[PDB]
Amino acid sequence: VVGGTEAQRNSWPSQISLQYRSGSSWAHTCGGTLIRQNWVMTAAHCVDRELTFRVVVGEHNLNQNDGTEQYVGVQKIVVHPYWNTDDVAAGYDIALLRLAQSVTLNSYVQLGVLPRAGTILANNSPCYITGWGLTRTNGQLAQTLQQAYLPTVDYAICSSSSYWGSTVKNSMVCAGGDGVRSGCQGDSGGPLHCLVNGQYAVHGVTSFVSRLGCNVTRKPTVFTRVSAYISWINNVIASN
Ligand SMILES: [Ca+2]
Numbered sequence: 001v002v003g004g005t006e007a008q009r010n011s012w013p014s015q016i017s018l019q020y021r022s023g024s025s026w027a028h029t030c031g032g033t034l035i036r037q038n039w040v041m042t043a044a045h046c047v048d049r050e051l052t053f054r055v056v057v058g059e060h061n062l063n064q065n066d067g068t069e070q071y072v073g074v075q076k077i078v079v080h081p082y083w084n085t086d087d088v089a090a091g092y093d094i095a096l097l098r099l100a101q102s103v104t105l106n107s108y109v110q111l112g113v114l115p116r117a118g119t120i121l122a123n124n125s126p127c128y129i130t131g132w133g134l135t136r137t138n139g140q141l142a143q144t145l146q147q148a149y150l151p152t153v154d155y156a157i158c159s160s161s162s163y164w165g166s167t168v169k170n171s172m173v174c175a176g177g178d179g180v181r182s183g184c185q186g187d188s189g190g191p192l193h194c195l196v197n198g199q200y201a202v203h204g205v206t207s208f209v210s211r212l213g214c215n216v217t218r219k220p221t222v223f224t225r226v227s228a229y230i231s232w233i234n235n236v237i238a239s240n
Contacts, residue, residue: 001131002215003181004148009060010068012130014112014202015145016040017059018097018189020051028062028141031131031190033112033202037102039237041112042189043205043224044083044095053077055099058108061144062132068108073100078236080229091171093207093224096236112191113201117230121203123154127175127194129206129221133187137213141186150176150183150192153220163218171228173204177220184214192223202226 018030018040032042032055040055047053058068076098083092103109121127129150132142158164158174168174175192176182183190183206192204204223210216226233 001146004146010108013110046189131187131190134184174220179217182215183221
């Protein structure tokens, strides 16, 4: 997250860190949202390499054991069957991970709230991105979870030639684009939390930024629109 601040500790309790094993070590690669006690929602592009993955819930500082974390392996990976690794702009950047154990819910570990199927937010709706991604273009992962305010940019504006044009589809949500705040590498897969009727819900799964850099004016961060995938999500959980 570029242009953000450190989140209050455990204040986004559905946020997970997705990590892969590198020799004897684990490394953060992406975010995700806990949606059931044994299911996490993330981006397809985060899990379509053949690595060993684990999920960390209740995480805040990636480099110290805080005592709120629970560490669990990934038993099954369900990528959307229409995802194409070579064409992030075609969409379908979503996957569900079935965890090896159910996590224990508590103050620090909660299920994320998803929107009802097909919900669309008005332009400039209030949302926050969270994650441990780079805190500058070509910089360093954050040690502590970051948040930044990133208001929505509706489909008509975002797909205009002044923004992303035809790179963005209506199965995506765009947010930010101010040139200061944005998602960045290592935030992918994680949530965009948007305020609806006083409650935050996870309306996006972080998918991509410009090749020119993370915080680029009129290139908002682009997210998979969760509300376009509610039927798919429930189908996968019901049948897996
Ligand atoms: Ca920690």
